[PDB]
Amino acid sequence: KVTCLVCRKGDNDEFLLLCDGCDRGCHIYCHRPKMEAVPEGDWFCTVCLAQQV
Numbered sequence: 001k002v003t004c005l006v007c008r009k010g011d012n013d014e015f016l017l018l019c020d021g022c023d024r025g026c027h028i029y030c031h032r033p034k035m036e037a038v039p040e041g042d043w044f045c046t047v048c049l050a051q052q053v
């Protein structure tokens with residue numbers, strides 16, 4: 001039950017980032033600014049970035 005915040009589909013899961021703060025995701029091809037690959041190390045969605053201080 002993992003979907004992309006931008007386009008609201010959950011296909012091409014090999015291109016699908018997973019937030020390490022929660023259970024949301026993003027296709028790398030939907031992300032702006034540009035993202036050429038899935039990174040090693042942690043990625044945080046914009047909802048989790050709002051919780052930062």
Ligand SMILES: [Zn+2]
Pocket residue numbers: 004005006007008009026027030
């Ligand atoms: Zn997408």
Ligand SMILES: [Zn+2]
Pocket residue numbers: 019020021022023024044045046047048049
């Ligand atoms: Zn998150």
